[PDB]
Write a protein that binds this DNA or RNA. Structure first.
Ligand SMILES: [Cl-]
Ligand SMILES: [Cl-]
Ligand SMILES: [Mg+2]
Ligand SMILES: [Mg+2]
Ligand SMILES: [Mg+2]
Ligand SMILES: [Mg+2]
Ligand SMILES: [Mg+2]
Ligand SMILES: [Mg+2]
Ligand SMILES: [Mg+2]
Ligand code: NA
Ligand code: NA
Ligand code: NA
Ligand code: NA
Ligand code: NA
Ligand code: NA
Lengths: 95, 154, 140, 156, 186
RNA sequence: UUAGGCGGCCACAGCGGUGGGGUUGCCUCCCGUACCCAUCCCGAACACGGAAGAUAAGCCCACCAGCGUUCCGGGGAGUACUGGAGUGCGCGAGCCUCUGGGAAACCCGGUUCGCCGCCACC
RNA sequence: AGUGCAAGAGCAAAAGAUAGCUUGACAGUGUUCUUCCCAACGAGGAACGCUGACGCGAAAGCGUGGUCUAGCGAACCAAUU
RNA sequence: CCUGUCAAACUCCAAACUUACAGACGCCGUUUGACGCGGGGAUUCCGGUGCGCGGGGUA
């Protein structure tokens, strides 16, 4: 890469298809998950806060407690265990 | 149920391919195993497709091989009708073979080694650079085509 | 059907597009209520570079305040036709514009469940001339 | 310079003028020839079909087209036919003209990428195929071997 | 509309009915919403919660079913508002609902407005709602005193036939009084 | 749901168009400014108070496909591209065979003029 | 369109405009991610909390500077609280 | 309206494929103790080739 910022190479994943443009529905930004639940991490280009480092877009971790409103999802980066602070806006229930 | 015979060595073959062959219990050239026709098994032989020979064997042929090349999970013991009868749920080789073909049981379930270490093809095979439709000995075969290979490697 | 379809005057805006005022006074008397400043946008050569800046005033008259004004304004005008809106409006003159529409307009001006008026329920240049002309004067 | 240096479609597509500057103008004079006032209302329609994907520098396009159309004056300056070269030289080509250090070249020309089987030229003629000859001279000046294909014309 | 790239607003925004930005703030509390809505002739008060396929209304009250308790006055006014709030508030209590936040939808937070009146009522019914006392009306206007005094400048009954001539903020008391003990649907 | 309130999905729901519907459950337009409140000017809006009138707007209901959209059939196409294999072909560029996947444009014909949840209600 | 500045991205009852008011560009201490994919490594950066005190708002709530990714510096020594 | 062409820094579309998690089969581990944890000792940080995909370059 020509530079090493967090958005380097994120033009694709952090953009919306023209029709999904504009403010997202609140229902999901308010979803309540329980510890133990599997959730898919995917940033919502429309929602500025509650994000995580792009690299983890695609991961499916396990909710383990929360911090403030945000949740703490455990994921495994390659072989390393990591804890990710993400808001519901960017989470989906697996299955 | 198909019969798998590895016809190509390990040198240079993708690891994930070699591993598959290993998961299907074949670790040497000319070694053969019987595999149920399932989605999961189908996907594995498709992957191993270019280094193996496979097809559905005829009852007889299976029997001949079972008789000539079957082995206990351990030891030299010949697997003959008697062995079969005194050690398995069946009464004789034919009984066993029918069970394998109909995929009702497996070589392990009956205390037999998952592997039929065949002999090199008497007369040689059709080559390992082309598939069957091309005159080679690789890929899927005819029940008659698989038999001839198995039989020559009896 | 009618009664709720027959035209009516909704606001008459009287504004003096000056270029920098003392003119408010006359607008206050000529109408009957306070005028409003007219800031401008964009910086331009007519020494009008100032963004927020008084450059005219206006007065939006409604109801009687509007008629009682038109009952002297119109007479001072002659024109008609071509000089009319596609929505049945018209401006003559110091400027004096007249906005005309039918009974259910609030539907497009309210906050909740607002909606734009359907072309059919809109006012045409013709249906307008008629309404006004039929009120102390002549068309073209 | 030689066609050898640019006849292969091995490099990335390089055409964004928004990031390329100093691109030389095309030598191709025209694309529509003959009676361009008229539309393809002709009995016979022959085409010159390139038989291999290649890159053709505007150089070759002009030389090819000229040699063909210039010849189609076996029919006359205002003859009845219409000739069309359908491809355009979009692909910008460079040259590293220091050695291999900072070798990204400088713009030196343009070329058109044609894929085997496309028709680069289409002529429209009445049963009077002098055009077939205009093309034996045209493919004479482009890298690939070519196929002279006739379309509407069972007037053999 | 125009093309494949065109962006159409969410249905409830097209209909200009829901202000989603505010709705998100509302939902934040994690508490039920006390939906305060109006109509030219009526006033509605609902207690909504969140749900898998959309909102759930656990307790509601409409200015029309107010008469069902002895209301013999118009229903698009202050006293009516308060009461409808109190009514819903109580049904709310019965439902096992203890707290909620005020959703005034697309209305304006003007002081002493009917919504706030609706809020006051629901509060008094026993419901716990984040509020601000001095944004509410001064009890008398809630009773409907501003109206009785308006009919004082009579010469012609403020009420076409209806009930009374000089109107009755007392009728208000009599009703609130009623809702505060026993009775059906509460 | 003989017209309501809050929503979910967020165009299958958009754009445009036709027909129908209200002594009342109703929603509206509508009437009107003493009050709470309100317009850098206007009770336009916002807010409050109210029913003389109206179903013309909106809204609700039934429907139209011309545009935009969703999905499906047949054709394009098992084409383009492609994971695995080859002492197959080609000066080469590159192509071909076996095996596992598999498109886009476009045409023609259907579909689509929202679906669903909770509450309230002759 | 605008949103201070590259490029890419976000945003319309707004993240833009206008008006008004305000100083959360606050003190303290952390969690996590990043810096350094995987996989050890400082400064720096961010996201998200808590404690204290505040601003605005009817209120839910928003404010841990500017919508996001650049704008930065160890030990020793000095001045400063 | 008709007609002729393009895109590494275009996208109304869109694979093969790669990839997170989960189940299933397979294989493996529970005296051959896997997965993992803690510690001792390194070597190593001139690589090269074939094939696929590349970027630069006439090569
Ligand atoms: Cl993170
Ligand atoms: Cl409302
Ligand atoms: Mg990319
Ligand atoms: Mg053994
Ligand atoms: Mg021999
Ligand atoms: Mg051979
Ligand atoms: Mg009607
Ligand atoms: Mg910020
Ligand atoms: Mg990849
Ligand atoms: Na969105
Ligand atoms: Na040099
Ligand atoms: Na040639
Ligand atoms: Na001013
Ligand atoms: Na109507
Ligand atoms: Na750090």
């Amino acid at each position: 890469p020509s530079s090493n910022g967090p958005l380097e190479g994120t033009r694709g994943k952090l953009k919306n298809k023209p029709r999904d443009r504009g403010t997202s529905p609140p229902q999901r930004a308010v979803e309540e998950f329980d510890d133990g639940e599997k959730v898919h991490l995917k940033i919502d280009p429309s929602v500025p806060n509650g994000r995580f480092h792009p690299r983890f877009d695609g991961q499916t971790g396990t909710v383990e407690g929360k911090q403030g409103d945000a949740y703490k999802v455990d994921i495994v980066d390659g072989g390393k265990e990591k804890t990710i602070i993400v808001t519901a806006a960017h989470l989906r229930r697996q299955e | 149920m198909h019969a798998l015979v590895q016809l190509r060595g390990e040198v240079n073959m993708h690891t994930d391919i070699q591993d598959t062959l290993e998961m299907l219990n074949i670790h040497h050239v000319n070694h053969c195993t019987l595999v149920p026709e399932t989605d999961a098994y189908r996907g594995m032989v498709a992957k191993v497709n270019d280094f193996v020979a496979f097809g559905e064997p005829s009852q007889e042929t299976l029997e001949t091989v079972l008789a000539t090349r079957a082995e206990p999970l351990e030891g030299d013991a010949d697997v003959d009708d008697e062995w079969v009868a005194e050690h398995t749920d069946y009464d004789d080789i034919s009984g066993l073979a029918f069970a394998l073909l109909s995929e009702e049981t497996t070589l392990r379930e009956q205390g037999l080694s998952p592997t039929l270490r065949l002999h090199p093809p008497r007369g040689g095979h059709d080559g390992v650079k082309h598939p069957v439709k091309e005159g080679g000995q690789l890929g899927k075969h005819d029940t008659e085509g698989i038999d001839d290979l198995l039989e020559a490697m009896r | 059907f009618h009664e709720m379809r027959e035209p009516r005057i909704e606001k008459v805006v009287v504004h003096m597009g000056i270029g920098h005022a003392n003119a408010e006074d006359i607008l206050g008397e000529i109408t009957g209520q306070m005028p409003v400043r007219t800031k401008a946008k964009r910086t331009v050569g007519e020494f009008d570079i100032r963004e927020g800046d008084p450059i005219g005033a206006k007065v939006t008259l409604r109801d009687e305040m509007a008629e009682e004004f038109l009952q002297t304004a119109l007479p001072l005008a002659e024109l008609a036709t071509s000089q009319f809106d596609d929505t049945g409006n018209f401006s003559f003159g110091l400027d004096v514009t007249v906005n005309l529409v039918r009974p259910g307009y609030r539907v497009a001006k309210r906050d909740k469940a607002s909606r734009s008026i359907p072309t059919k329920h809109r006012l045409n240049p013709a249906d307008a001339v008629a309404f006004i002309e039929s009120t102390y004067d002549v068309e073209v | 310079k030689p066609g050898a240096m640019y006849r292969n479609s091995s490099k990335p597509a390089y055409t964004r003028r928004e990031y390329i500057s100093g691109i030389p103008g095309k030598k191709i004079a025209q694309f529509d020839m003959g009676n361009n006032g008229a539309g393809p209302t002709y009995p016979a329609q022959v085409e010159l079909v390139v038989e291999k994907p290649v890159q053709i520098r505007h150089n070759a396009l002009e030389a090819a087209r000229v040699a063909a159309n210039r010849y189609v004056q076996n029919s006359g300056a205002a003859a009845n036919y219409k000739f069309r070269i359908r491809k355009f030289p979009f692909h910008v080509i460079r040259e590293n003209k220091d050695g291999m250090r900072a070798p990204f070249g400088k713009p030196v020309g343009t070329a058109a990428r044609v894929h085997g089987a496309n028709h680069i030229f289409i002529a429209w003629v009445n049963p009077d195929p002098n055009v077939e000859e205009a093309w034996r001279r045209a493919k004479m000046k482009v890298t690939p071997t070519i196929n002279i294909d006739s379309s509407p014309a069972g007037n053999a | 509309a125009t093309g494949p790239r065109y962006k159409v607003p969410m249905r409830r925004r097209r209909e200009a009915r829901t202000d989603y930005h505010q709705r998100l703030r509302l939902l934040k509390s994690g508490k039920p919403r006390l939906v305060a809505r109006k109509s030219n002739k009526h006033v509605r008060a609902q207690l909504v919660t969140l749900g898998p396929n959309g909102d759930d209304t656990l307790a509601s009250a409409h200015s029309s079913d107010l008469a069902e308790y002895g209301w013999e006055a118009p229903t698009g006014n202050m006293p009516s508002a308060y009461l409808t709030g109190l009514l819903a508030g109580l049904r709310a209590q019965e439902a096992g609902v203890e707290e909620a936040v005020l959703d005034i939808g697309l209305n304006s937070p003007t002081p002493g407005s009917k919504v706030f009146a609706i809020q006051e009522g629901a509060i008094d019914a026993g419901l716990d709602i984040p509020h601000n006392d001095d944004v509410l009306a001064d009890w008398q206007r809630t009773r409907g005193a501003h109206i009785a005094e308006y009919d004082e400048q009579l010469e012609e009954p403020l009420y076409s036939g209806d009930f009374d001539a000089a109107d009755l903020p007392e009728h208000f008391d009599e009703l609130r009084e009623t809702l505060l003990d026993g009775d059906i649907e509460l």
